[PDB]
Write a protein that binds this ligand. Structure first.
Ligand SMILES: Cc1cn([C@H]2C[C@H](O)[C@@H](COP(=O)(O)OP(=O)(O)OP(=O)(O)O)O2)c(=O)[nH]c1=O
Ligand SMILES: [Ca+2]
Ligand SMILES: [Ca+2]
Length: 430
DNA sequence: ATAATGACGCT
DNA sequence: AGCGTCAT
């Protein structure tokens, strides 16, 4: 009825950089531009692990987590750039810094939530309402939306991609309710215009291309974003949700890509996101818990309330290294030395962080993984972080994990460690 | 023998 | 406090 909330109160975008580490390497090395190429860490073992893949290389079947030697088998022309290595581990500084370039530019338009090294949510509600004043009911030209897809359109009465895009946009714009400043669809459309500008600015000032989703909440925006990649943006309207969700595999919806998603599928005996509508909120709550049941009930109707959190800086700073199989650390001296290598990178980055962002970390968290254990972390322990000093931090870290050592001989370490992880947390202003 | 990161929920 | 889930 008239008391039915429709989740159309906000305009929310998610921006995501196209094959981000590859673009960073391609900006720096013009030889890699418009070529099949990939970013790889380490190179001794099977040519290194691939962690990012240009879209040209994707067309050959090259994927993440592939060994580089295996990728060459699919794509013999594949060009590689390798991650900087410092102190025997990967060093992602180039990408973190590239990330800051993009984030500060987006920050110029609106409050952003940094969702990863190359993704940000944008709450555009205020900017849209303001822009809606700039245009005194003035119709929105197709030319303000040159890279925008309208999900679900064209419908009813062209054989190439751009032809379809435009026909969809035209059908959308022709039906638009422009003399109504409260029309959710109009707000989204104005939201999409701004995101075009934001994306133009990002490309102009960094050289980096990205894709974006624009919708009424974060989950739909994130979904919308992946529908037309690379270098394009997608508007997903509230109206588009029933058809879109009608064949949308549950695992595609953010937070449903793991075990909860799988149990939703198994317990309810369904496949697609829209099928969730046929259950009461109480039923969903009984199967998955109050919080999940409530969230599921709203979400399958395109309604979600998770706000864009005003946070542009990460809340933790960490360094980890895995030591798979034969490389697992087996002596005290190895464990101490690698904790030191981790502590040294951490200290550089913390000192940087303290000068840039006026804050200090107050807690050190130490995480290890023992051989045979499938879990990410075998064990987590903490101590105070009182000095940005590598030798102290590495020493304290050893102290809080050292009795995990089950070995009879003091110089030996067992069970061998397959991962070391140090993370600085609990920042206070400074 | 993917990695190296991150955010947050549950108890 | 410490472990588990989900994501890039
Ligand atoms: C998913 C993932 C990404 N990354 C890095 C490399 C990616 O370039 C970057 C962001 O990842 P994604 O956004 O997941 O991937 P992408 O940018 O490479 O490609 P797409 O265009 O499909 O978005 O972070 C990892 O190091 N490990 C990972 O598991
Ligand atoms: Ca990306
Ligand atoms: Ca991403």
């Amino acid at each position: 009825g008239p008391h039915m909330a429709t989740g159309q109160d906000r305009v929310v975008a998610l921006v995501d950089m196209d094959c981000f580490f590859v673009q960073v390497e391609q900006r720096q090395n013009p030889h890699l531009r418009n070529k099949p190429c990939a970013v790889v860490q380490y190179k001794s073992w099977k040519g290194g692990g691939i962690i990012a893949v240009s879209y040209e290389a994707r067309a050959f079947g090259v994927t993440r987590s592939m060994w580089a030697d295996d990728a060459k088998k699919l794509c013999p022309d594949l060009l590689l750039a390798q991650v900087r290595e410092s102190r025997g581990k990967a060093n992602l500084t180039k990408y973190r810094e590239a990330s800051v370039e993009v984030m500060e530019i987006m920050s110029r338009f609106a409050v952003i939530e940094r969702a990863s090294i190359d993704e940000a949510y944008v709450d555009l509600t205020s900017a849209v309402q303001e822009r809606l004043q700039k245009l005194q009911g003035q119709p929105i030209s197709a030319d303000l939306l040159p890279s925008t897809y309208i999900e679900g359109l064209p419908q009813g009465p062209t054989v190439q991609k751009e032809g379809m895009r435009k026909q969809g946009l035209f059908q959308w714009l022709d039906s638009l309710q422009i003399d109504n400043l409260t029309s959710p669809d109009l707000q989204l459309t104005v939201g999409a215009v701004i995101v075009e500008e934001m994306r133009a600015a990002i490309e102009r000032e960094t050289g980096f291309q990205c894709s974006a989703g624009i919708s009424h909440n974060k989950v739909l925006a994130k979904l919308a974003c992946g529908l037309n990649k690379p270098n394009r943006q997608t508007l997903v309207s509230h109206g588009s949700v029933p058809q879109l969700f009608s064949q949308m595999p549950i695992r595609k919806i953010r937070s449903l890509g793991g075990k909860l998603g799988a149990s939703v599928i198994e317990i309810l005996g369904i496949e697609y996101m829209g099928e969730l509508t046929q259950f009461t909120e109480s039923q969903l709550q009984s199967h998955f818990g109050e919080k999940n049941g409530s969230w599921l009930y709203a979400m399958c109707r395109g309604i979600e309330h998770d706000p864009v959190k005003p946070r542009q800086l990460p809340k933790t700073i960490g360094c980890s290294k895995n030591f798979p199989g034969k490389t697992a650390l087996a002596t005290r001296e190895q464990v101490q030395w690698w904790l030191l290598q981790l502590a040294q990178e951490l200290e550089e980055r913390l000192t940087k962080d303290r000068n840039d962002n006026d804050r200090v970390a107050t807690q050190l968290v130490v995480s290890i993984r023992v051989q045979g254990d499938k879990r990410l972390s075998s064990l987590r322990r903490c101590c105070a972080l009182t000095r940005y000093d590598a030798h102290k931090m590495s020493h304290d870290a050893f102290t809080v994990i050292k009795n995990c050592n089950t070995s009879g001989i003091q110089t030996e370490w067992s069970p061998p460690l397959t991962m070391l992880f140090l993370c600085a947390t609990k920042f206070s202003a400074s």
